[PDB]
Each structure stands twice: as C-alpha cells, then as structure tokens.
Design a binder for this molecule. Sequence first.
Ligand code: CLA
Ligand code: CLA
Ligand code: CLA
Ligand code: CLA
Ligand code: CLA
Ligand code: CLA
Ligand SMILES: CC1=C(/C=C/C(C)=C/C=C/C(C)=C/C=C/C=C(C)/C=C/C=C(C)/C=C/C2=C(C)CCCC2(C)C)C(C)(C)CCC1
Ligand SMILES: CC1=C(/C=C/C(C)=C/C=C/C(C)=C\C=C\C=C(C)\C=C\C=C(C)\C=C\C2=C(C)CCCC2(C)C)C(C)(C)CCC1
Ligand SMILES: CC1=C(C/C=C(\C)CCC[C@H](C)CCC[C@H](C)CCCC(C)C)C(=O)c2ccccc2C1=O
Lengths: 161, 143, 80, 40, 140, 63, 33, 741
Amino acid sequence: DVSGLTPCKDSAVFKKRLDGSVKKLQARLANYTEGTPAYLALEQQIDQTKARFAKYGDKGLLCGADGLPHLIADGRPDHAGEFVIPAFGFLYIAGWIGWAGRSYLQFSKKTDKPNENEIIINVPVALGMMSGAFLWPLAAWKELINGQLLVPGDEVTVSPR
Amino acid sequence: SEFVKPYNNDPFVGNLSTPVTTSTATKLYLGNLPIYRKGLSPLLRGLEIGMAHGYFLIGPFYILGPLRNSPNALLVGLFSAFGLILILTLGLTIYGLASFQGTEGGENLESAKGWRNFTSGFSIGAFGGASVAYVLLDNISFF
Amino acid sequence: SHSVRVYDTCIGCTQCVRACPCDVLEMVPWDGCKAGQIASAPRAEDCIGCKRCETACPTDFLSVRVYLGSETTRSLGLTY
Amino acid sequence: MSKDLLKYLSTAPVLLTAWMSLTAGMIIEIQRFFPDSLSF
Amino acid sequence: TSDVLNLQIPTPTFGGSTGGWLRAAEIEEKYAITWTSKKEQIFEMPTSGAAIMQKGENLLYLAKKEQCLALSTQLRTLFKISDYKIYRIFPNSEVQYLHPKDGVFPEKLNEGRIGVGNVGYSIGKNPNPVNVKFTGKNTF
Amino acid sequence: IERGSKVRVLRPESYWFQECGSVATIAKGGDRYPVVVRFEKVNYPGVAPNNFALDELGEVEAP
Amino acid sequence: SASFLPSILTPVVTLVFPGLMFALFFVLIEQEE
Amino acid sequence: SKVRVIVDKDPVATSFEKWAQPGHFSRTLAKGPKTTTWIWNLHADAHDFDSQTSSLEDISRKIFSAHFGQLAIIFLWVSQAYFHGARFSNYSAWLLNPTSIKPSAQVVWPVVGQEILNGDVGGGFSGVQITSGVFQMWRASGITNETELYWTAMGGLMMSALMVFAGWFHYHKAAPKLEWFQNVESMMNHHLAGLLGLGCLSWSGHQIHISLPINKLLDAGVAPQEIPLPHELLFNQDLMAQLYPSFKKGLLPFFTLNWGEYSDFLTFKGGLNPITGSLWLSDTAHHHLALAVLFIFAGHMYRTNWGIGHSMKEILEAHKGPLTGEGHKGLYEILTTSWHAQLAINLAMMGSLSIIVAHHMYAMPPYPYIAVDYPTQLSLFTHHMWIGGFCVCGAAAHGAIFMVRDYSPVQSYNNLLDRVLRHRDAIISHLNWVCIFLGTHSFGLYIHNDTMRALGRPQDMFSDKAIQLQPIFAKWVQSLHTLAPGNTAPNSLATASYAFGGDVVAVNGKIAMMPIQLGTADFLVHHIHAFTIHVTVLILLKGVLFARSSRLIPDKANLGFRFPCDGPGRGGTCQVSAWDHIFLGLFWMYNCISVVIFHFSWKMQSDVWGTISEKGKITHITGGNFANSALTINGWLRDFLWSQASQVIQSYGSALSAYGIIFLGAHFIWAFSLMFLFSGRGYWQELIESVVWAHNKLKLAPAIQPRALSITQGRAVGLAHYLLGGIGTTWSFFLARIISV
Ligand code: CLA
Ligand code: CLA
Ligand code: CLA
Ligand code: CLA
Ligand code: CLA
Ligand code: CLA
Ligand SMILES: CC1=C(/C=C/C(C)=C/C=C/C(C)=C/C=C/C=C(C)/C=C/C=C(C)/C=C/C2=C(C)CCCC2(C)C)C(C)(C)CCC1
Ligand SMILES: CC1=C(/C=C/C(C)=C/C=C/C(C)=C\C=C\C=C(C)\C=C\C=C(C)\C=C\C2=C(C)CCCC2(C)C)C(C)(C)CCC1
Ligand SMILES: CC1=C(C/C=C(\C)CCC[C@H](C)CCC[C@H](C)CCCC(C)C)C(=O)c2ccccc2C1=O
C-alpha cells in the first residue's frame, strides 16, 4: 500500500507479536492458583491483549516490517481515523479553552478589582463563559468582523526600535 | 588572662598578636632564618636557602621517580633535581626583572643588584646541595 | 572610573543621594521641577558602580544613570 | 459552607487542583471504558 | 572643615580584628572617620566584631570609603550621631576632607553647589553609537 | 489636556508607550514635565505614576 | 638520519620554546611606562 | 514556684476569613497582586514568622502549633505503612518464608497497561516490591498477625486526629506565654527523662514481654498461627518461664539487686543471631534498659521549682580561658531568645545522627532477615545519607539567618561568637588551603592512576601491586575491635560487628555480614570523602561567617539574609548573600553524598554481598573487583556505572519498567535544571515582553502582569530541579540494580 506498508490484519509479524505478548502472560500465569484474583487479573490481561490486537487488525491500520502500526498523517480519506479527525477534535477543544479564558479575561478587566478576580475566580461567571464558549468559531468570527478581536496596533506597547 | 591582643598595639590593622604570630620562640625562629637574619649580604642569604632547597629537591625524584627501580636511579634523580633547580632559577630571574626595575641597588634584597646576588647565590647553592646529597646518598651504607 | 549622568526628568526626591554608599551624589539647586533641586555627580571618581541610585529612582526609566567604564582601585572596591 | 469559605475554595490553586483532578478522572475513566485507542 | 586631622584623638577600645587595613594602606591610600559621642557604648565594626566607642571624641582608620560611610550610616540610623567627618590619608601624611564637604549633608540642599554631570534632555534622546564611531568620545 | 483626561503616552522610552493613562495634576510653572499621569499597570520598579510633558501625550478622552 | 629529528625537535620546541615565551610574555606584561 | 504554666485564653478566633485573603500574614503582600511575583513571594514568606510579627511570643505559639501539625502528618504517614501492610501486602506469606518471598505492600490499578508493575513477588501475590524494611521491623516486634497491623493503623489515625486537635487548641484556645517556652531547664529535664528514658523503658518492657518470646518461637520453627497471642504471653509467668527460666523468680531479683539472675533474657553476647542474621533481641532489650536508666538519670540535672539542679547560665559562664576572652558568656540569652540558633544546632545534630544511623544499621542489622534483604539495606543507607546531608546544610542556613537577624553586638561583646567573627579570614584561609591540599592529593592520585594505566605502566600506579597506600590506622582499629571480646570486652561472647573482622554470617546461602577488607582503594575513597566534606564545610562556614559583612561589602547585614547581589559594581558582586552560599553548598553536599553512596554500593556488592556454597565457597555479586577497579576514574565509569546500569536500561517490558521510566525522567529533570542554573532573568523578561505583545494584540493581557522569576527564585528553582533529578536518577539506578540481582 502506502510506503510499502502492509495491513496489520495481513501481517505475519503482527501475529507473531500477538503470540509473544499472550505467551509472556501465559508463562506468568502458571505460578498462580485458579480462582485467586491474581489469576483473574492475569487472564483479564490476556483477554485485553487479544482484544487490542484484534481491534488494531480490524481498524485498517498499516504495519511495517517491524509489525507495528504506522500512522499516515498524509490527509488521505481512508486514513482519516488517524491524525485528521483527532486534529479537528483537538482544534475545537483548544479553541473552546482559549475562548473561555479570553471571555473571563474580558469580564475580569471590566470589573472594579481585576487583580482579585484572577487569583480568586468568580465561579458562577467563569462557569457561564466556560459553558458559553461552545460556539467559539462563530463568536470569534463575529468579533473579528466587528473589530473587537484585535487591537489596532498603535495601542499596544512596544519596545523602542 | 588574655593571650590574643591587637598586633603591634594597633587595634585596626588586619592582624592579631596570637601566641603563633608574636611569641618569642617564633621571633627567634623567623628572625634567624637566612632571609631574616641580621648582618647578611643577599648572596649569602640565597646560598644558605639554596643548599637546603637543593638537598630537599633531590629528595623525592630518586625514590619516587619513573626510574626508581633502575641502577641509574640516583643519577636520574640528580638530573631531575638539576632541571627543577634551573626552572626555579629562571623563575627567580624573571621575577626580579618584573619586580625590580629602575632601582638604586645595594645590599637591600628589594633591588636589582640585591635580587641578582640573591638569585646567583640560590642557584649555586641549589646545585651544590643537590650534588652533596647525591654524594651522601651514594654512600648511605657509611651511616 | 565610572561615569554618572543625571537627566532633566529629575523630580528632586533625593532618594539617589540617600541610596549612595560612596558619597558620589549631591543635591544642587534647580528650577525645572516643583522641588527646586536636581541631583548632581561631582565625585564620580568614588563611584563603584553598584547602581543603588538607579534602584532608588521613582521616575519611569530612571533619571540618574551609571555607565560602567574604566576600573581603578576605588571603583573595584579593593581594600588591598 | 460559608460566604468566606467558598471564597477560599474559589482561589486559583484549589480550583486548579479540583479541575485537574476532574480532568484526570474523566480521562482515566475514558481509558478504562475505551482502552488502547490509536485511530478514531 | 579643612584638611586638618588630629592624630592624637583617642580610638575606640577594640580587641583587634582580622578585617583591618592591609599593606596597601600605608602605601596607597587610607581613610579615617572622626565623630563625637555622648556616652560609652558598643557599636559593630564594619570589619566584623564589636568595639566600645569612647565618650567624647573618637578616631578610626579604615581601608575604603565604603567602610567609613557604612559606619556613618550605622552612627545615624542607630543612636543619633550626625557630626562625623570622613578623611583620606595619603602615605606622605597628607589628609583630604571628604564627607560633609560643604559642611552640610548631601541630601539637604545647599546654595553654592554646581551641578556636575547634568544633561539637558531626557535619557531617550542620546545619540546613536554610530555617530561617535572612530572618535573616542561616547554618547553619555 | 485637563485634570481627569485620558491620554496616550508618546514617549518611546517610557514603560507605558502607546498606553492609556489618566491625568492627575497639571502644574502651572517652570516645570519641564508638568503633567502627572497615573496608570493602572505598574512598571518593573512598581511605580504607577510618572511626570510627562505636554507634547508626549496624545489625548483620548475629555473629562 | 631523520630518526633523530623527533627526539631532538619535539623536546626543544614543545618544552624550551613555550617556557621562554612564557617568561618573555610575563616580562613584557609587567614592564611599565 | 518559678517553673509554672502561664497560658492566654482564646487569643485568636477560629474563622474562615483570612483563608480567603491570601498574603494576610505580611504587610506588603496583603495589598493584593500587581505582578506575578506576589504569588512566589506569598509562597516564600509563608513560614517566615520572624518577618510577620515582631513579638517572640506569637512566633513561638505559631512554631508550637506548626509542630503539632507536622506530628499529625507523621502519624498519618505511620498509619499508611501499617494499613498497607494490613490490607495490601503479603506479610503473612513473608512470615511463612522470609527468604524467598519478596516483600510487597503496594498494588497498582489496571487502567492503562500499568498492571505489568504488579510483579511476581511470591506467595501468590502481585504488587510492587517494598524496600522500606517495614516487614522486618514488624517481625522484630512480634506482629505475626494481620489484625494488629490494622489496629495499629487505626491508632495512628486516632493519634493524628489528636495532634490536629492539639494544634488548633494551642493556638486558638490555650496559647502559652513567652515565659512558658523559655523554661529550657524544665524542657530539658522533661525531654531527657520522660521522652527518651521512658520511651526506652516502655519499649524495653514491650520487647521483653512480647518480642523476645514471639521471635524465639518463630526462630524455633513454630508457624505464626500457632504462636500464643501477645496478651496470652503478657500475664503468663508459666509460659515465659518455659521459654526463659528466670520469670519463676519474678520481680524479686530486681528489687534485691540480684540482677545476674536476669541473664537469660538480658544478655551481652553481641555478634549476630545465626538464624536471622540480625542482632540478638535480648541484647536489644538490655541496650534499651541501659539507655532508659542513663536517660532518666541524666534528666535530673537542671534546676526547676526545687532547689536541686543546675542552671545552664552558670555552667556556660564558668567556661572561659586565656585564649577565648569571656568564653561562653551570652550564649544562654542567644539560645533562649532566638529560634534560628536552636535550628542551627538541632539540624546539625539530627543530620549527623541520621548519618550515624546509616553507618550503624548496615554493619549491625537490627531486624531479623534484613541483612539478606540487600535492597532494604541499600535503600536505608542511601536514604539516611541524603536526609543527613540535607539537615546538615539546613543547620548552616539557619546559622546564617541567626547571624543576619538575631545577632546583637552589645549582647555578644568579646565572647566566643565575637572572637570567631574577629578572625574569620584566618579560618576561611586555612580551610581553603586544606580543601586545596586534600583535593589535589585525593583526586590527582586517581588522575595519576588513570594516566599510568592508559600509558601502559601499571607498575607505576598507586595500587596494591605497586606503590601502596595502606590505611594502617583503620586496620589497627579493626584488629583492636576483633580482639575486644575477652580482653577489653571480657563479658562479651562475640564482636560488636563482623565488619571489623571475624566470621562470615550466612542465612540460607546468602551472606548476612562478612569482614570488610580495607586496601589502597578504600584509603583513596576515604580521602575523597574527607575532601568533599571539607569543601562543603568551607562553603557553608564562609556563608555563616561572612553573613553580616565582608571586605567586599561592608554593610551586607543591611541587605538581608537573601538578596541577589549588590549590583555589577566592585567588579561584580554576584551571589554575595549567605543564601547563595547555602545554594552553592547544597551542590557540594549532593556531590559528597553521591560519592559516599557509590562507595557503599560498590564495596558492599563487591566484597560483602553474595552467596555461599559447599566448603565455604564465597561468590560475591560483582566478583571482588573493587580492589583493582576503584583506583581509576575509568574503572569507576566502566565497572560501576556502565556495568550496573544494565539492570535499569533493560527493565522495559518487566515489573521494573517504572524504574527505567523514572531513570529517563530524572535525567530530563536534571538537564532541565541547567536552564535556570545557567541563564539570567533579563533575557527571560524580554522574551516575556515579546509574548505579552501578542497577548496585548489579541486582548489577552492578564491584569496580574507576567514577570520572569526573580534571581534568587531562579537559583532556587534550578537547584531544586538539579537535586530532584540527581536523587531520582540515583534512586532508580540503585533500586533497579539491587532488586534484580
Ligand atoms: C486562556 C488563556 C490563554 C489564551 C487564549 C492564550 C493564547 C495564546 N498564547 Mg498563551 N499563555 C497562557 C494563557 C493563554 N494563552 C498562560 C496562562 C501562559 C503561562 C503558562 C501562557 C504562555 C504562553 C507562551 C509562553 C506563549 C503563548 C502563546 C500564545 C498564542 C499562541 C497559542 C499558544 O502557543 O498556546 C500555548 C499556550 C500555552 C502553552 C499556555 C496554556 C496554559 C493554560 C492551559 C491556558 C490557561 C487557561 C486558563 C487557566 C483558563 C481560566 C479561565 C476560566 C476561569 C474561564 C495565543 C495568542 C505563544 C505566542 O506568543 O504565540 C504567538 C507563546 O510563545 N502563551
Ligand atoms: C597531587 C597528586 C599527585 C601525586 C602525589 C603524584 C605523585 C607522583 N607522580 Mg604524578 N601525576 C598526577 C598527580 C599526582 N602524582 C597527575 C594529575 C598527572 C597527570 C597530569 C600525573 C602524571 C605523572 C607522570 C606522567 C609521572 C608521574 C610520576 C609521579 C611520581 C614521581 C613524581 C615526582 O617525583 O615529582 C616530584 C616531586 C616533588 C618535587 C616533591 C614535592 C612535594 C613535597 C614532598 C612537598 C613537601 C611539603 C612539605 C611537607 C611542607 C612542610 C614543610 C615544613 C616541614 C617546613 C609520584 C609518585 C612519575 C612516575 O613514573 O611515577 C612513578 C611520572 O613519570 N605523575
Ligand atoms: C602547522 C602545521 C604543523 C603541525 C601542527 C606540526 C606538528 C608537529 N610536528 Mg611538524 N612540520 C611542519 C608543520 C607542522 N607540524 C612543517 C611544515 C614541517 C617542515 C619543515 C615540519 C617538520 C617537522 C619535523 C622535522 C618534525 C616535526 C614534528 C612535529 C610534532 C612535534 C612538534 C614539534 O617539535 O614540531 C617541530 C616543528 C618544526 C620545527 C617545524 C615548524 C612547523 C611549522 C612550519 C610551524 C607552523 C606554525 C603554526 C601555523 C602555528 C602558529 C601558532 C603557534 C606559534 C602557536 C608535531 C606532531 C617532529 C615529529 O615528527 O615528532 C614526532 C619532528 O621531528 N615537524
Ligand atoms: C515528660 C513530659 C514530656 C513529654 C513526653 C514531651 C514530649 C514532646 N514534646 Mg514537650 N514539653 C514538656 C514535657 C514533655 N514533652 C514540658 C514540661 C515543656 C515545657 C517546658 C515542653 C515543651 C515543648 C515544646 C515547646 C515543644 C515540645 C515538643 C515535644 C515533642 C517532640 C517531638 C518528638 O520527639 O516526637 C515524638 C512523638 C511522640 C513520642 C508521640 C507521642 C505524643 C504524645 C503527646 C507524647 C506524650 C504521650 C503520653 C504522655 C504518654 C502516655 C503513655 C500511655 C500510653 C501509658 C514530644 C511529643 C515539640 C513538639 O513537637 O510540639 C508538638 C515542641 O515544639 N515540648
Ligand atoms: C527542621 C527543618 C526546617 C525548618 C523548620 C525550616 C524553616 C524555615 N526555613 Mg529552612 N531549611 C531546612 C530545614 C528547615 N527550614 C533545610 C534542611 C535546608 C537546606 C536545604 C533549608 C534551607 C533554607 C533556606 C535556604 C531558606 C530557609 C528559610 C526558612 C524559613 C521560611 C521557609 C518558608 O517559608 O518556606 C515555605 C515553604 C516552601 C516554599 C516549600 C518548599 C518546597 C520545596 C522547595 C520542594 C520540595 C519538593 C518535594 C520534596 C518533592 C517533590 C516531588 C515532585 C515530583 C513533585 C523558615 C524559618 C528561608 C528564610 O528566609 O528563612 C528566614 C530561606 O531563605 N531554609
Ligand atoms: C569536575 C568539575 C569540577 C572541578 C574539577 C572543580 C574543582 C574545584 N572546585 Mg568546584 N564546582 C564545580 C565543579 C568542579 N569544581 C561545580 C559544578 C560547582 C557549582 C556548584 C562548583 C562550585 C565550587 C565552589 C563553590 C567551590 C569550588 C571549589 C573548588 C576547588 C577545590 C580546591 C581543590 O582541591 O582544587 C584542586 C584542584 C582540583 C581538585 C582539580 C584538579 C586536580 C588535578 C587533577 C591535580 C592537580 C593538577 C595541577 C594543579 C595542574 C597540573 C597540570 C597542569 C600543569 C597542566 C577546585 C578548584 C572550592 C574552592 O575553590 O575553594 C578552595 C569552592 O569554594 N567549586
Ligand atoms: C505502635 C504505634 C502506636 C502504639 C503505641 C503504644 C502501644 C504505646 C504504648 C506505650 C506504653 C504502654 C507505655 C507504658 C509506659 C509505662 C511506664 C513508662 C512505666 C513506668 C514505671 C515506672 C517508672 C515505675 C516506677 C516505680 C519504681 C520502679 C520504684 C518506685 C515505685 C514505682 C512503681 C513508681 C500508636 C497506635 C500510638 C500509633 C502508631 C504507632
Ligand atoms: C491540510 C493538512 C495539513 C496541513 C495543514 C496546514 C498547512 C495548516 C496551515 C495552517 C496555517 C498557515 C494557519 C495560519 C493561521 C494564521 C493565524 C493568524 C491564526 C490565528 C489564530 C488565532 C488568532 C486564534 C485566536 C483565538 C481563537 C479564535 C480561539 C482561542 C482563543 C484565541 C484568541 C487564541 C497536514 C499536512 C499538516 C496534515 C493533513 C491536513
Ligand atoms: C525559564 C526561566 C524563567 C521563566 C520562567 C517562568 C516565567 C516560570 C513560569 C511558571 C509556570 C507558569 C508554572 C507552571 C508551569 C506550567 C504552566 C505547567 C507545566 C506542568 C508540567 C508538569 C507538564 C525565569 O524567569 C528565570 C529567572 C531567573 C533565572 C532563570 C530563569 C529561567 O530559566
């Protein structure tokens, strides 16, 4: 496929890693009596290892010559389960955090004691901005068009140069 | 009692008159060494310092040197002492050149003539002391 | 010896003279401020350069300025 | 509670510790329920 | 006052310290401070230790001007003595008067002083160092 | 400018260059920097006000 | 015979030359006007 | 009655009001933050009670209540060990076989694949191996059951709640006056008798009545579940007489001074118990009895309400000579009016005591089966070394604080403090010369050995096959200790410890303790230790002595205890404060303790620890390579660090993988320290300005203005990161090495 990589469901080294991973825990299992919670924990580990390897095979990941999954951050649609969709998710969440912080900063600036509102948070107002930052890509765009997002540039302090 | 007092009756000089600095024993020791003995020309001061120092310096090269377990151990120690004595003489000469410039000379040690006499005495004394300790070490079975 | 200069943004609040540990600075009469005095540095050869005057200035970007320069036995603070 | 104990609980370190504990708990429980996720 | 110092003024009773002036005070430069006391009391020396100051007039030799002015600061902020005089003794027995020069303290205004080092513009209007290149002078 | 005006500082070496401050007192005399401007942000020494000249302030809001 | 040149030049250069240069440099440092 | 209880009633109201007002304790910080320096100043000045109030009484009350809170924390920390032993351990399976079951009392939750840390410690248990030695400590007390651990944990929780209540009570309800704290004679008597002597007496009673019979039955082979319970042994003269045939006579020989009849359970046999490889518990009980009598006797020295006793002012003022002027006059007022002086003495004593504990618990294993538990021995030694080094640095720190703040020249004229301050240049100069001499010799012998071995001249080295440096004094002292039983310890069966020579003690193949031979490498590394200790002493003593003034800065006391500098003047006055001297000396403490624990680890792995087989064939862990490889720095680098890091770098995929993770992370933190240690504040302030421009552009400027860390704070952050990274790397390396071999 891409870069000479094979699917992990069709790779022999991936299956060999599966067998080694389950065999290590099976060898660890032989010194415990059955029914003891140590035995149950070890067989739960074996089942979790099998489930993880089966999931990695089923999701369509590409494994290399070492038998380990390789992520394709290219932007292809068939590998959108890799980088691109977590990219969109993180961009939304990070913009949410930034917009909540910015909104609370505006509110604390507009009060009588801006310093005391930052070490001691106004929790109801902070929760209000924090929950209302869910529509940050629209509110930020509206503030950008309205000219409230950016200072003109002659009003921010600058070093003499 | 109080055996630590201001040095030379001045309470604001950076020294103390402890039983180490101003004892009569320490004055007799450090007023009769060659560098401090009264009525000595600088050449004799240098000579008396040099012979003891050369005796000293041929001390460690023979016993601990790289050729200690060799039939030529004492000769190599003597040559190493000679080299160290030459280095110390060169250091004394360059110290006298850097320190005493445009001086009136005389029997004072802190002058060009005095330091040249002191360095000459030290060099000849150091070579002589190294040779004397070579002679005594070569016939150590006499004692 | 370091060079000390006092600029005309002085307000004559005397803190540089009090902060000086080497008697470098002194107050001379002036008419450019409400206090009627400006700092002066007539003994800059006794400057050590510790910049205690610059810590004591209240004006925005301090009026008394010490520029480190040549080193002598006084500006190095040598007792020996 | 009190009008001044809640103000102490509103301070930056207490709120930071509580919110980081909540975030760590949420992520740990997500890892407990949906483990070993590489792709989406 | 003038460039005169009484060499026979009694000194504070001190047990001797390892902080006094070294060889380059009888060779290069030495400083002394003289003040007037009302009572016999104990003060901390700038070169470590404690000394008893004599009731009356005192004289004390130090190695630098910083030590003399630190001792004067101690004699001001503590128990109130404000008539100290700091001198500078040269190896050829020549004395020069330094502190309370014009007779009054430098923080108080005194008519008759000339401003030295005053600059007739704000600090942000100094010339660029390119304009003083290959001249030897500076932009201060 | 007057007392209580909101001004913008044009001195380039000031900590509050291109920043807004409030005029506190304008002295009428021979002072070279008569206008006193107080700021809400302290500088590195922690000093809130400073004395400014009439040509170093650009004015924003009338009293 | 070119088998003597290391044992001649290396001590002469490496030991004697910088020692004399250090002494000369120190003397030139400490001379004054 | 001069010694009395005088107490103020309800001085401070209990309220959650100053909780919501941070920085209330100081005048400057209570006005609110303007920059992000008020936060760090709030954290730095929280416990500096001397700068918050000028009243010594309120300072003392704060100190007392804080002591109560600290004791509550320590009680909770004891309760955690007892509860984890009760509920999360394999202590019973370890009791059934304390030579093949590895102790473990800490289990992890499986969420993220970290269940691999639950290794096979034996006994049908999965968990993280424990090197604290609490298991052997419990076995030495006769805690064979898992109910007693649970109830000890519950009692520890109850005591922690008691200390919390006492701390609230003595600051908000019944705060003692200043005259209560200044009763140092009464305090000294009460501590020496009631704390120390009564603790020794009660612990000796517990030992005699519980731990001697239970451990005797355990060493006899009786399983722990068929051993009589301690309450069944406490009130049974018949059973104790069956075990120790001297309880038939009862308490009568004690009162008739026929104490020789109690020699069955109060012995001075010395040596080690062959069954457990530890000290005899009868020796321990006898030791605690002797200590109890000695401490109760010593607690009757100082004067209280009754006419007998000493005054400590009269003892000090009588000790004066010709060379010291007024002597110890004025030290009583110094130590009864200042808390920092008492810290400066007590921290030094506690650090030296921790170091003594580290040196004594390895050559004299006091708990059963702790000698054959090599990770426990290594961890305890290194732990107590690090604690001692930190405390001995703190002693110098508080001596400097006292000298800056609480020193008074009128009070301390011509006494010992004044005479020390009047010749400090001589002290610092001679200690400087000693440091240079020791460093040149001790390190240049290593460098000379490196050069001789690299030049192919092993016959010119400083080795046992070459020019020898035999520690003749240490060997003579060892020979004196080996011949002590019978000659200079006539009523002694064996030597004090087998490190001085004697017989090898083995417990089930493993070596408990064997003689430690000293050679030229031991001479060399002991001189290295002396040199490092001397340089640390030089830095700390120079900081204490020059805390008030120096030739460079005559008015250093007016600048404070901690301050960054006095400008770039006088050529540069960087790090002139006594705080910066403590900051510099902490690095040298780290160096000294690291070399000490490296010496201990290599020498014990090379010449003591190992196995024994038939006909007494001794095979050590590393193979006896310390004698010839610890002579060169390359030998150290190749045979200690490179050779013993194999366990910590190959721990991935096993139960020791957390040690490799902590190895890498501590390397990261140690390298992260140099960022603060090398750089300076102004660059970071300008970079923060550049970031603040973007924040101001996007309307994101905080009202609390962001600032770079201060110079003192930057140095403190760099030093703390350096110490954390170094101690973490050494911790992970030691634990992963010694657990796996
Ligand atoms: C919510 C507040 C907030 C917002 C919107 C931003 C926004 C920005 N920062 Mg930033 N920053 C913040 C807080 C914030 N910062 C804090 C608290 C610090 C100190 C640790 C920094 C330190 C910092 C540096 C050193 C740099 C930026 C940079 C930047 C810019 C690029 C994005 C970036 O690198 O993010 C990275 C952000 C961080 C590494 C800091 C995140 C810290 C936390 C997670 C955010 C604070 C959340 C806050 C506590 C929420 C409380 C509000 C609530 C009560 C409602 C961008 C304008 C960069 C720049 O100038 O690029 C042009 C840059 O170099 N920031
Ligand atoms: C300080 C550490 C130290 C010490 C003690 C030695 C010691 C030695 N080295 Mg050595 N070396 C060192 C570091 C050291 N090395 C380092 C760091 C290097 C690498 C750069 C080397 C590289 C080196 C080489 C390459 C060689 C040696 C050799 C030697 C041996 C003979 C050297 C000799 O005679 O010098 C001359 C010694 C003196 C002039 C003695 C001066 C010291 C005196 C005793 C001081 C006395 C003070 C006195 C007590 C004060 C009190 C006076 C009062 C009573 C009035 C000797 C055993 C040689 C050898 O083969 O070894 C067998 C050799 O070839 N060294
Ligand atoms: C810069 C080049 C260079 C360097 C680094 C060396 C280095 C060395 N030469 Mg060498 N050599 C050079 C050029 C150089 N050579 C040239 C051009 C010649 C031809 C005349 C020779 C002829 C030569 C002989 C015949 C011998 C060496 C030997 C040696 C070795 C011992 C040092 C010594 O006694 O030198 C002595 C070298 C000379 C007297 C010749 C002068 C070297 C050049 C011309 C000087 C260059 C100076 C350079 C620019 C640095 C300037 C700064 C300086 C003043 C600090 C050493 C490895 C000895 C050897 O083999 O030991 C094993 C030896 O016997 N050299
Ligand atoms: C015999 C009486 C006695 C005893 C046992 C103690 C014991 C103690 N004092 Mg103390 N003290 C006493 C008399 C006594 N004092 C007197 C008369 C004065 C006034 C002059 C003081 C003034 C004083 C001050 C100012 C301070 C102490 C502190 C301390 C503690 C030191 C920390 C330590 O070693 O932890 C060891 C910990 C323990 C031994 C745990 C047990 C804790 C309890 C409270 C001990 C007593 C229990 C009880 C009496 C015994 C019951 C036996 C029963 C089971 C049969 C320690 C608990 C310091 C401290 O930490 O403050 C809290 C401190 O700052 N004391
Ligand atoms: C008996 C122990 C003891 C006590 C009571 C004190 C008490 C005091 N010390 Mg002191 N000190 C001690 C031991 C002690 N020290 C030791 C052992 C050292 C040597 C390292 C020092 C070094 C020292 C210095 C250098 C200074 C003090 C200062 C002070 C005073 C104020 C402290 C303060 O507010 O800090 C508040 C408390 C904190 C800021 C907490 C510190 C947290 C540390 C740095 C991090 C710990 C990390 C942790 C162990 C591991 C983290 C792991 C990671 C993965 C999270 C106070 C009187 C200062 C002062 O001005 O005195 C008048 C001062 O400048 N001390
Ligand atoms: C490996 C790094 C290293 C080394 C070698 C040193 C070396 C030294 N430090 Mg140090 N230091 C270091 C890191 C290091 N430091 C770090 C990281 C810090 C930051 C916390 C400090 C902080 C510090 C302080 C605060 C102090 C020192 C002091 C000292 C000196 C101790 C006196 C002594 O024995 O000197 C002898 C020399 C050595 C031990 C090293 C060389 C030994 C050679 C091998 C033998 C002799 C060689 C000879 C002289 C030259 C021959 C070869 C030549 C002809 C080419 C010494 C110069 C103390 C000091 O100067 O007071 C006395 C002191 O107070 N250091
Ligand atoms: C582990 C622990 C714990 C516990 C502890 C305990 C258990 C303790 C005990 C203690 C005790 C239990 C003590 C006791 C003591 C006792 C005593 C101290 C006694 C004494 C006695 C005496 C001193 C006597 C005297 C006499 C005589 C001899 C003569 C005269 C008469 C008489 C009789 C008086 C807790 C939980 C807390 C916590 C955790 C840890
Ligand atoms: C396709 C793709 C890719 C690429 C990407 C790229 C290339 C991107 C770029 C990007 C860019 C080139 C960007 C730029 C930008 C600019 C700017 C200018 C921005 C800005 C921003 C801002 C301004 C923000 C703001 C805010 C908000 C809104 C929220 C939060 C808060 C704050 C205020 C911060 C890769 C291959 C990787 C992968 C696949 C996919
Ligand atoms: C980097 C640096 C700064 C800048 C450092 C600053 C401004 C510290 C910032 C503190 C932060 C905000 C605390 C929290 C850190 C992170 C936000 C959290 C990281 C959490 C990890 C465990 C992931 C200095 O001010 C400084 C001063 C003097 C000498 C050296 C230095 C120096 O090296």
